[PDB]
Design a protein around this ligand. Structure first.
Ligand code: SF4
Length: 83
């Protein structure tokens, strides 16, 4: 079950970025964002994932202030976690 502050499918920014909390139900292949082959991309390996926000599988994303994403999710702003 998602936390009360999870990013939802109805969030305008989530719609614009094609977020899904389950990357296997995402359009990561179509987007072909650079840095890793698309099938390998999810929030856990994204630069915008905030490891010190949230709990368990529900973590922060810098792009979604006040909310939580799932580490197994994806959106079109996916960017390799480089530091
Ligand atoms: S920017 Fe990165 S951490 Fe945030 S929802 Fe998109 S893929 Fe997940």
């Amino acid at each position: 079950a998602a936390p009360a502050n999870a990013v939802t499918a109805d969030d305008p920014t989530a719609i614009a970025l094609k977020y899904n909390q389950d990357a296997t139900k995402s359009e990561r292949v179509a987007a072909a964002r650079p840095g890793l082959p698309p099938e390998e991309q999810h929030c856990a390996n994204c630069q915008f994932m905030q490891a010190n926000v949230g709990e368990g599988d529900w973590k922060g994303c810098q792009l979604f202030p006040g909310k939580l994403i799932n580490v197994n999710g994806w959106c079109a702003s996916w960017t390799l976690k480089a530091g």
